[PDB]
Each structure stands twice: as structure tokens, then as C-alpha cells.
Design a protein around this ligand. Structure first.
Ligand SMILES: [Mg+2]
Ligand SMILES: [Mg+2]
Ligand SMILES: [Mg+2]
Ligand SMILES: [Mg+2]
Ligand SMILES: [Mg+2]
Ligand SMILES: [Mg+2]
Ligand SMILES: [Mg+2]
Ligand SMILES: [Mg+2]
Ligand SMILES: [Mg+2]
Ligand SMILES: [Mg+2]
Ligand SMILES: [Mg+2]
Ligand SMILES: [Mg+2]
Ligand SMILES: [Mg+2]
Ligand SMILES: [Mg+2]
Ligand SMILES: [Mg+2]
Ligand SMILES: [Mg+2]
Ligand SMILES: [Mg+2]
Ligand SMILES: [Mg+2]
Ligand SMILES: [Mg+2]
Ligand SMILES: [Mg+2]
Ligand SMILES: [Mg+2]
Ligand SMILES: [Mg+2]
Ligand SMILES: [Mg+2]
Ligand SMILES: [Mg+2]
Ligand SMILES: [Mg+2]
Ligand SMILES: [Mg+2]
Ligand SMILES: [Mg+2]
Ligand SMILES: [Mg+2]
Ligand SMILES: [Mg+2]
Lengths: 111, 205, 131, 64, 120
RNA sequence: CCGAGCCUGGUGAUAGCUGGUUGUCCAAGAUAGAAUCUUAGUUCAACUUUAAAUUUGCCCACAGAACCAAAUCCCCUUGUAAAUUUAACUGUUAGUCCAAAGAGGAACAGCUCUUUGGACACUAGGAAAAAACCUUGUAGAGAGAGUAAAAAAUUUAACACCCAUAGUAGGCCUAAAAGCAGCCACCAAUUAAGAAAGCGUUCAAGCUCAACACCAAAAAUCCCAAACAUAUA
RNA sequence: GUUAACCGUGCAAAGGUAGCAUAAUCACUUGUUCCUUAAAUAGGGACCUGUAUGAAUGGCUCCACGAGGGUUCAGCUG
RNA sequence: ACCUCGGAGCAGAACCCAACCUCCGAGCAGUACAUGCUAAGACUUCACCAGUCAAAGCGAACCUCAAUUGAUCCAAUAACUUGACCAACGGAACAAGUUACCCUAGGGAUAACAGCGCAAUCCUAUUCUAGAGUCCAUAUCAACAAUAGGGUUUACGACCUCGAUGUUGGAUCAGGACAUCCCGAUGGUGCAGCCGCUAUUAAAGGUUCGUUUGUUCAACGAUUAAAGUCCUACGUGAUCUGAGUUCAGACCGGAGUAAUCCAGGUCGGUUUCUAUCUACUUUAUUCCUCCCUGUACGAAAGGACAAGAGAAAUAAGG
RNA sequence: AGAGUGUAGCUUAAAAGCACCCAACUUACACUUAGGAGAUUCAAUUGACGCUCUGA
């Protein structure tokens, strides 16, 4: 008969959309997941899904940085407290090294 | 207590999750108990295979019968049976889910030492019944002292070194000389020529 | 990534342990969970003493697993001569201590003795109790 | 594949067999400080920095 | 699963013995390969076939020239069992404009800019 | 020829089902998945064909893709020649074996189900015959040439000759247990012979041994090429 | 509970009565026993957990009759 | 049994990935009431549909949660909005049994018969010596297990055949294997003799008649030297039977409201073919009797081989 | 009598940073907030007082 029934769910198609070095315009989704596999860094936002999106035009970069959580989020704090006195956690981040300058001064007129 | 203790069939706390039959616990050489631990003689398993409770019982009994308990002792080097095995009822059509659990079995790999022996004795005294045990067992097995084992290893090493055949298996594999990886397994880089399935060709190199 | 050289830089769970006998071996020794029962008549005093003990333990790199308090026993006594009542109370406060190597324990005991407050009594014994 | 690390990994020296003898950051502040220090150090794995970035007098003072 | 075989680079390192066996020297290495195909692209993976095509080795036994340089070498490695790689070596000077027409590839890999049909 | 007559008409009824579908020649061309009263079908996708516009497309190297094996993605060079879009369509959308990673089943199936790669459903040569193993593909004529894969090897168990007296029928235990039912002890005389290692004794007795001396096959019509150890790779 | 008259207890509209019974009657089933045969998974007669018998769904006897289906003495006959 | 949705494994490192594979769960709840309005740029459950995320801006402050859901048209509604366990969950606005009285179109894409594969089950032989066998593992039997082989059974699979490969038994005729039931020739024996048990070798010859029974089987009676095991499309229906069994009639029990049904029982129930081709159509065993003999052997009970003579029986040929 | 030297507990600090102490939250610890205390042993890289170590 088969006692087990139910798990016929498809794959979520999650993962990295933009790998390191890829040029990225503002608003594009860099990477999608459940549970922070990758974290947001410079010029990278977060949705409600934990999906990372780019906040500026330029090159995506991945980097191992030091994890220091917000003091109001409690679990992380607890974990930190638990750790021995020389250790630091480390975590993988996604930055967007911005390409163009925010703007340039151009000549309007000679008054 | 110098005597093989009772290895009861199944654990006392059984497991409701049915495992899939991964045969990779048979395939290849044993990562686990290759070397000794305070026992001069042993039964070396020269091949992979699952040990039923019956086999265990046999091992226990024969040794006990032909043991000199004051002068010698014995140890299990294999756990009690723990991998469950589902058999379906007699003569069912295919499908309708996975079958119910029947019996439990320890996987042994080649290179494992199954039973260990020690005490005031030579290997010549212990050979007789250990050989019998080996014969009884469900794989290539060999009654093996420490010294004997060492000798065997040395011989193997020599073979590896000596051979005038320029073409080893390893060389052909890793370099991918004939695109031969289209034939070979991905495990045939670590195992090399020596291991095929549960079988371990000890001569070849 | 796994194939990268940086693999497992985020690994933290081996730095945390998220999961009793008296081991007296041969040259390395351990007393098993010693309960220091601080019995006294003043509520404050016993507490103070307990606190001090705890502090000492902390200083000395010794674990303090439990530091509970036991209930106050109302020993109601009739002062016989004209019945004059005197409802006294005895307060027991505990500080459990695990690991302790040969030389340390004696020293600790000595320290405790030195520090003993005015009208307070000790009892150092094993954990096997029913609260 | 399983390449070895280029230089020394972080959190390698401190672990040991006995975790429960060690001091631990009972606070947040200490941890934060440590993190900052780590950040300040160079490392070998790329990072944010890679891509973006008398006696008499004393005596007198004391007297004062 | 059959896979796209990654080959370690201890395989591609010439020993002194190897050198002795074959012709070449480690200093002053050959510039150019003659790369001949000696095996079919059938009964093989598509990638290999593609590589072969790229190399210009559709015809067997019909040699092509190539540069002895990393990218090309990598490609060759992908299909090295399908092929015979031998160094192009020029005893006489390499072709000018007057010679061009008169050339001959030969066995033993040599271009030979004087090609007469007369004996010595 | 009645589960509801026969005839004519509606009726060229309707058939996701079967059968059939006619001159020549050339060219490109093989099966990810989706829903579905749907799994004998179909619409979309995917692959495929044509005509267009194009600018990159394959192959890729450092760097990079997480905490609780084999590889892959990404990817400049380089070797190459195409891929993407636009316009127009049909047809495939009931597959097989082989290698490899697995799952179900008996670590059964020419079994079933996924993935990765072959091959076949396209010619040829081999593996006896042979779809799926190997060698090999772009074509035609030649009474030319060099090659590729490509022919299965093995034959097996002799083994010792001699010589054995004693404290002692050790104690203990046992109706009796004598080297040998079970324990403790295992000392000791002569060159040399265990407080006995096989049998054997109801207990004894006799036989040895240790020691001196001496030096792989069995099934059903009829075995299945014929045959061959010797002139130079 | 005492093979049970009997007792205790529940549910029901009533609780299968007379009869007949291994039947042309789920299975167990070659049920058990007497006759029949040298020999009987057949036939006849008895016994009765038929747990799925049974009363105009007709129950049970019985005279005649039946190309109905079984068994059989004798005679006979390729 | 399942049918929609979600998490983990199979699927170990970008996506993707199955089974009537293994395991957990969902068909909400809580907090808000700017859960306002707009809008660059992306992801996407391999299509579409559905889903996801979101910079800036305007307007205001100073969402949690893994799944927690349902198209169109229709309804209800002044309007905003709200309607399904349409759970067969991409949903037909609303429909059920049965057919052996059946029919049609197909299918060897899919079963029963047979073959073929495989060999779990089944049978056989070795290995191993625990244990039985007053003692003694191997006269004989034999546990745990090991290594082979077979293709008698029950299955499993679905590769040939559904523009038909016709079935259970029996008759007829038998070809074959040997894993020998008898007949021969040996070895061992817990073989004195007679009987035996066991192993080697042997397939020239043979392997009964009845009661019951649709039956192979099975039981029983009488014998016999013996009344072998199997294969051959469960040998053999263009040679036969058709008692069973696969139809239309009918009863008993039961199931069902009923039509009707039952891997229940029972009475009844048409078996067609002139041979085109291949193939083919005259090559001694055994039992008993008499003696040997009431001898060998055995303490007695009992009781032989061989050698010889005579009678039969079947089979083959007249 | 000789050797090593010599920043408060400690330091590839140069008057630092960690250790430390009292309160208030705390059962207590821990955290946190308020406070608290501290040092170049002394004379021009040299010498003379302080320890540690080895002798008598
Ligand atoms: Mg899943
Ligand atoms: Mg799926
Ligand atoms: Mg029509
Ligand atoms: Mg259809
Ligand atoms: Mg073509
Ligand atoms: Mg529908
Ligand atoms: Mg198949
Ligand atoms: Mg199939
Ligand atoms: Mg050609
Ligand atoms: Mg003797
Ligand atoms: Mg009945
Ligand atoms: Mg009759
Ligand atoms: Mg009539
Ligand atoms: Mg999409
Ligand atoms: Mg905004
Ligand atoms: Mg539906
Ligand atoms: Mg649906
Ligand atoms: Mg009928
Ligand atoms: Mg029909
Ligand atoms: Mg078929
Ligand atoms: Mg069949
Ligand atoms: Mg015995
Ligand atoms: Mg058919
Ligand atoms: Mg036909
Ligand atoms: Mg025979
Ligand atoms: Mg037949
Ligand atoms: Mg016929
Ligand atoms: Mg009739
Ligand atoms: Mg006929």
C-alpha cells in the first residue's frame, strides 16, 4: 500500500543567479535562498524571502567577512556568548562594487 | 572473561526508519578496524560481505569449543548486527511500497579483522579452528597472525615496486590514457585494480 | 565552497558544546560534584557566604554547575522553665563544584576555613540527594 | 577535490580538547572588539578591503 | 555517472628518463605540433567530438599544425587518446616565399623546403 | 445472423482505433519537461526544418559559488564558426541495450524507476550467427596501396626410519579412578624419555607421539569446424 | 460462569419454533459409524457447531408417473 | 491504497531529476489596521496560467510564518467587495450499478495457456566437522554455516504470438535424460548366514491388473524381479476422447434494494478440415523349479553363492 | 660569594590595553549601568637598591 505519501514538491530553482564578476544593473536579483547561505553586503538588499538583490550598477563580488549580528536578534547573540574567547564566526557575503560615478557636473549655459 | 560474548540478533531498540541498501558499505577496503588492538592473531576478511546472526553464532560457538580459556582469549572486532533488511512476503507482485523489516546484518569490508585472539600460545595452535571459521564465513577470509599479516604486506609492497610491466592500472586510470574512464568507475581511482565489487583480487597490482 | 581553500571558515558548531562520577585514577584526580551546605540562622549571612564562595570558585577556574537553596526549617522551640515560644529558622544554601586536582582541594578548604563567617556551619559531601 | 588552505585558517589554534575550561566571551562587547581586530588584520581570502579600501613632564602632569 | 575527466598535472611532467627515451629537450622546446587523429569521434562523448572538430581533425591520418601553447595543450588533453602528437621540427630554414610551393611533411615530422624527386 | 425485425432516408453517421495513402533526384533532420475524464490522445514547452536580421556562440584560466566522491556552474585567453533574435510551419511528445552513480526487487531477471555518457532505431569491418560490445562514418568508378578493431588460456595432493627403562598405581578428589573423568602441582634418576600430546582401558594393560641413539562434477533429438606442441615478427 | 438444565448480564421488533440435516445446501470434508465391494473421494441407513438448514422464498412425509440425475441384483453381450 | 500544497533523503559541491521509493508535515494561527498609492530593475517550480522580490518617488512613521490554497463563466452586491473537501484539488453547471444475453473497434503496447529470462522458493552434490550412532565426528544420519550445479514446483518478469500458438486428465504411439525402481558388475558396512543400509559403474531389456476418484495425485485390494524420477508446447486433439474445464438453461447456500454476482456446490450443454510442402512408411531378456543341500556360514533359529539340468513368462520373427 | 635580570596581576604596549575591586540589577553567577584603585627601584646607553637561581 505504502505508508508514506505526500512529498511530491518540485525544486524551488533557488541558488545564485549572478556569479562573481558579473555586471549587474540596479534591482537585479543576485541570489535566492531559504536560510542565509549567502548574506547581503555592500549595495545588496534583502527581500522577505532572504533573496539578495543589487542596489547599484556594477560588479558582483563574493567575500568571507566577519559576522557581527544585531544585538536585538537574540539567538545569534547567545551563540556568540557561548563561543570561546579567541574565536570569530566568519560568513560569506555578496558586495556590488559600483561601476559608474553617481553623476558628473556638466555645463548648462554661460550667463 | 576470555570467551566471545553473546551477539544478540537485532538491537534492543529497533529502528522504524527503513534504510536503503547502500552496497558501498561492502564495496572497497575497510577504513575501520584494519590494524590490531591487543590480540596477536585474528581472522582477516579478504572480501566484502554482510554477516548474518547465524554466522556470528557460528563464530562464537566454534571458537568457544576449541578455546583454552585459562591460556587464551578472544575479542569481537565487528559490531552487533545493525543494518536492517526488508524482505517482502512470499510471492508478491512488484511495487505497493517497500517491504517490512526481516533481519539485521553487519557490513564487513575487505581488510577488516573480524575476530581477534591472544594469550599464551603460538599461531600454529590457533590456525586450526580460525581457518575453519574463515571457511564457514560468507567471504574470502584468512586466519592471520600479526607477523603473517606484516609479511603479506611486505610481499604486496615488493610486488608494487618490482613488476617489469610498465603499465600499471593506476597510471592508465589517472592519466586517462584510453578514455578508459568511460569503462571504469569513479571508485576505480581509489580502489584501483585490486577491488571489484565486494571482491578483492589480492594478487594483482 | 568545498573545493576552494577557504572551505569551512564559517564552521562554528565545533566551538560550542550543545548536548556524575568521581574519577580518582593514579596521578590525575577528580572529586565528583561536591555540595557545600552552608547552614545558618541569618538569611543574609548564609547568602553572602555562598556568594563569596561562588566568586572564589570563579576566580580559581572551577565550575559551579548548581547554586540552589534548601528550604528554611521552622524549629519551633518551647523555652521551658511558663511557656515562652521562640520560632527559630535554619537556612541551608548550596554551591556545587565538580573538577578538583590533588593539591587544590586542601587549599580551597583552608581558604574556606579562613573566611568562615560568624555563626555559620559547613557540610561538604557528594551529590546523591533528594530535593 | 579538496584543496588545503593557503595560510592559517581562523579559529584553528584555540579549539583544543577541553572547550569547557576556556574563558569565552560572556559579553557582546568583547566579541565585537575581537571581530573588529580581525577585520583590521589582512587575511588571504579576499574581502571588503580588497575591493573597496619626558619623565619630568610626566611627573608634573601627575602632580597637577 | 560518466564524467568529463580532470587529469592531474603530475602526469604532464617529463622525467630525465622520459627525455632520454624521446627526442626533445626541456630548454628550447618545439614551437609547433603536428597533431594527427588516430581514432574515431564515434563511441565517445560529444565534448570530445566538438574538441576534435575545433582542432580541424575530422579526417583521420590527415595532419594539422598547432601552436605548442597552454590553451591548445589543454584542448589536446581533452582528446589526447584520440590523437598522435609529434613536434614539427625544421632541419632546413622555415619556408620563405620562394620555397612555399616546394614543401613535404614526411614521416618523422619535418617540413623540408627543398623537395626534389631525384635521389642522392 | 431478435438483449429487440427488415427496408429506405437522415448517413460520405462517428471512429484519440486498425488498415491503406501511387513519378525521379538531392538536401537538413532523433525522443528535457506541462497540464489534461489524461497517459492508445493533446495543447504548450524542448528538439527539429525553412526564409530572414545579426553579433557574438561554443571551447574556456586565475578569482569566486554554507553552514548543518566523480564532477558542475561561472569563466578572460586560445582553437574555431556560428549562436541569438525575427517571420512561417509541421512532426517527435507509447523507446531499447551497454558503461557509470543510485533507488525498488532476491546486492533475481532480456525485471522496474531516476541521473551522466555511449550506441542503436543510418553504411561498413569485427566479436561464430548478433540492434544496443569494439573499429569506423560525407558516399561514385578502378582487376591499386597502407591500416583499424579483430584468433582464450589452463592440469593440479608419496613421504619419513628407529626406540621407549625407572621415584610413581604423583597427591587431592574418587566405590575405582594409575601419563591420560575434574582440579591443584608439573618436581625429578640414569647419555636421554611430558607428572604426558593422540587413540585405548570398567580401573589396570597394551598401541603410538614428544626424547636418546642412527644418519572437482550431472539433463533430456546428435559430440561439434577439420586439424596442429619444432625453419627464425 | 455453574457437555451443560441453571445462574449473572446486555442489546432486539422478534430473537430460527416444528421439522429435517454432511443434503442439488461457503468452507473445514475422504466429517464419524453400520450395511454394500477382495478393495468404495460412489450408493443406502444412522449420528449432529447447519455459526451460511428451516416452513406458500413453503418445511417435512408419501401413492403413482419421469428419454430428469444417481446407486444396484441377475442376465446379456466384441 | 493514492489524486492539491510544503520540508528532508534518494539527488554528497550552479539549476533540474523518477517510482504504488524512504520520512515528516499543510488545508492555519498570531500581530497589525499606511496589510496606503505608485514604480526603475530582476527571479520563477523546466510551457502557459499562476507565483516571488524590489531601488527611487508620492503619502505616512520616528509584518511574523515553510505549506496554510482554487481559474473562467455565473451568482450575491448602490459600491467596495464575497461566494466551492469545484480535495478526481488547471475545476464538465448537474449523472449509477450490472451484463455468462451481449456487441463493435483495437491490443501480444496488457493478462490466462505454452515458450523465453531469472532462480527467491524447490531439488542435488561437495566443503566444514558441532551433534546423534554403549565408545567412535566420515557403517549410517546430521545442526550452524560455506562453494557449486539443476531447471521437476510455487511465484516474479511481460520479451514472441489476441487478422487465435486450442486447455485438465485418459487412450494411441512413444523419442530422450539418468539424478538406477528392477536386472548386471564392484567398494564400504554397526556385512557370520539369510535380509539389509550406503557409495561407485551401467540406460542393451523391463518397469502389472483392479475398487474409489473428471483428476494428476491419493488411499485401499491383489500381485510383481520391479511396479523408478523427470523431460519432450505440464510429449502426442489437422490421431481419438471431452468425464472435468472456458459460454448461453437451471436449482441450494451466501452476497446484493435489484439487474446480477461467488478463484462455492450441483444437473444440462455442437470438438470443423479432401494433406500443397518437409519428415517418415521390413536392421533376446526375465522369473520359477530340481539338484548343489538342508552343504558353505551359524552355538541354535535359521540358511547361501557360483557350476549344472529342467520348465515357464514376456518381447522379436515366422 | 657568583649568574639572570627589574612597566601595577600579565604583555614581539609605548605611562596603554586587558586582567582587578565596591555598588545597583541579580536565588547566585553572568551581562549591563554607575563608581574605585593602581605602576619605569634610584643617580649620570653606564653605575648603585630589589627579587629569582646557585653555593657557604
Ligand atoms: Mg523532494
Ligand atoms: Mg517532482
Ligand atoms: Mg470515416
Ligand atoms: Mg486515446
Ligand atoms: Mg542528410
Ligand atoms: Mg478535468
Ligand atoms: Mg528493460
Ligand atoms: Mg518494460
Ligand atoms: Mg571516405
Ligand atoms: Mg605400551
Ligand atoms: Mg458444505
Ligand atoms: Mg462404477
Ligand atoms: Mg413427461
Ligand atoms: Mg519559467
Ligand atoms: Mg520607498
Ligand atoms: Mg480531474
Ligand atoms: Mg489535476
Ligand atoms: Mg447464466
Ligand atoms: Mg471483436
Ligand atoms: Mg508483449
Ligand atoms: Mg508465462
Ligand atoms: Mg558424538
Ligand atoms: Mg492470443
Ligand atoms: Mg495469420
Ligand atoms: Mg549413474
Ligand atoms: Mg499438451
Ligand atoms: Mg497438433
Ligand atoms: Mg441429456
Ligand atoms: Mg476432431
Amino acid at each position: 500500500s505504502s505508508k508514506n505519501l505526500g512529498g511530491k514538491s518540485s525544486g524551488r530553482r533557488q541558488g545564485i543567479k549572478k556569479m562573481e564578476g558579473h555586471y549587474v544593473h540596479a534591482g537585479n536579483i543576485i541570489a535566492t535562498q531559504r536560510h542565509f547561505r549567502w548574506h547581503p553586503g555592500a549595495h545588496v538588499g534583502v527581500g522577505k524571502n532572504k533573496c539578495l538583490y543589487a542596489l547599484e550598477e556594477g560588479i558582483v563580488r563574493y567575500t568571507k567577512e566577519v559576522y557581527v549580528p544585531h544585538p536585538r536578534n537574540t539567538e545569534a547573540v547567545d551563540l556568540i556568548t557561548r563561543l570561546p574567547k579567541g574565536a570569530v564566526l566568519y560568513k560569506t557575503f555578496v558586495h556590488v562594487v559600483p561601476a559608474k560615478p553617481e553623476g558628473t557636473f556638466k555645463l548648462v549655459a554661460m550667463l | 572473561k576470555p570467551k566471545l560474548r553473546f551477539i544478540e540478533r537485532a538491537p534492543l531498540v529497533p529502528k522504524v526508519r527503513r534504510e536503503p541498501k547502500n552496497l558501498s558499505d561492502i564495496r572497497g577496503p575497510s577504513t575501520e578496524a584494519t590494524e590490531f588492538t591487543e590480540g596477536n592473531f585474528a581472522i582477516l576478511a579478504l572480501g566484502g560481505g554482510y554477516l548474518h546472526w547465524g554466522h556470528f553464532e557460528m563464530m562464537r560457538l566454534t571458537i568457544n569449543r576449541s578455546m583454552d580459556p585459562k591460556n587464551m582469549f578472544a575479542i569481537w572486532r565487528v559490531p552487533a548486527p545493525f543494518k536492517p533488511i526488508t524482505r517482502k512476503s512470499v510471492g508478491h507482485r512488484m511495487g505497493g511500497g517497500k517491504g517490512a523489516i526481516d533481519h539485521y546484518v553487519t557490513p564487513v569490508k575487505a581488510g577488516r579483522l573480524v575476530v581477534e585472539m591472544g594469550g599464551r600460545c603460538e599461531f600454529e595452535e590457533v590456525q586450526g579452528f580460525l581457518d575453519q571459521v574463515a571457511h564457514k564465513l560468507p567471504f574470502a577470509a584468512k586466519a592471520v597472525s600479526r607477523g603473517t599479516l606484516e609479511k603479506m604486506r611486505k610481499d604486496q609492497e615488493e610486488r608494487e615496486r618490482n613488476n617489469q610491466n610498465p603499465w600499471t592500472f593506476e597510471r592508465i586510470a589517472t592519466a586517462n590514457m584510453l578514455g578508459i574512464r568511460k569503462v571504469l568507475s569513479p571508485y576505480d581511482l581509489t580502489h584501483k585494480g585490486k577491488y571489484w565489487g565486494k571482491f578483492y583480487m589480492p594478487k594483482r597490482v | 565552497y568545498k573545493t576552494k581553500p577557504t572551505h569551512g571558515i564559517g564552521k562554528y558548531k565545533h566551538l560550542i558544546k550543545a548536548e556524575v562520577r568521581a574519577i580518582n585514577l593514579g596521578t590525575d584526580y577528580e572529586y565528583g560534584v561536591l555540595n557545600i551546605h552552608l547552614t545558618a540562622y541569618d538569611m543574609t549571612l548564609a547568602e553572602s557566604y555562598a556568594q563569596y564562595v561562588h566568586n572564589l570558585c570563579n576566580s580559581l577556574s572551577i565550575k559551579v554547575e548548581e547554586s540552589y537553596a534548601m528550604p528554611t526549617k521552622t524549629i519551633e522551640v518551647l523555652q521551658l522553665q511558663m511557656l515562652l515560644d521562640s520560632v527559630l529558622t535554619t537556612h541551608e544554601r548550596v554551591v556545587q563544584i565538580s573538577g578538583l586536582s590533588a593539591t587544590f582541594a586542601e587549599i580551597f578548604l583552608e581558604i574556606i576555613q579562613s573566611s568562615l563567617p560568624e555563626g555559620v556551619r559547613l557540610s561538604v559531601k557528594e551529590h546523591t540527594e533528594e530535593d | 577535490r579538496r584543496t588545503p588552505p593557503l595560510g592559517p585558517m581562523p579559529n584553528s589554534d584555540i579549539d583544543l580538547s577541553n572547550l569547557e575550561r576556556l574563558e569565552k566571551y560572556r559579553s557582546f562587547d568583547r566579541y565585537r572588539r575581537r571581530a573588529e581586530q580581525e577585520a583590521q588584520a589582512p587575511h588571504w581570502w579576499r574581502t571588503y578591503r580588497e575591493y573597496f579600501g619626558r619623565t619630568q613632564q610626566l611627573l608634573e602632569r601627575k602632580q597637577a | 555517472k560518466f564524467t568529463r575527466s580532470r587529469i592531474p598535472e603530475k602526469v604532464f611532467q617529463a622525467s630525465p628518463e622520459d627525455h632520454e627515451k624521446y627526442g626533445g629537450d626541456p630548454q628550447n622546446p618545439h614551437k609547433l605540433h603536428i597533431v594527427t587523429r588516430i581514432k574515431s569521434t564515434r563511441r565517445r562523448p560529444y565534448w570530445e567530438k566538438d574538441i576534435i572538430k575545433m582542432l580541424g581533425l575530422e579526417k583521420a591520418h590527415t595532419p594539422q599544425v598547432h601552436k605548442n601553447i597552454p590553451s591548445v595543450n589543454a584542448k589536446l588533453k581533452v582528446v589526447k587518446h584520440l590523437i598522435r602528437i609529434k613536434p614539427l621540427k625544421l632541419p632546413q630554414g622555415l619556408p620563405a616565399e620562394e620555397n612555399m610551393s616546394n614543401t613535404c611533411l614526411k614521416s618523422t615530422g619535418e617540413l623540408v623546403v627543398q623537395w626534389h624527386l631525384k635521389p642522392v
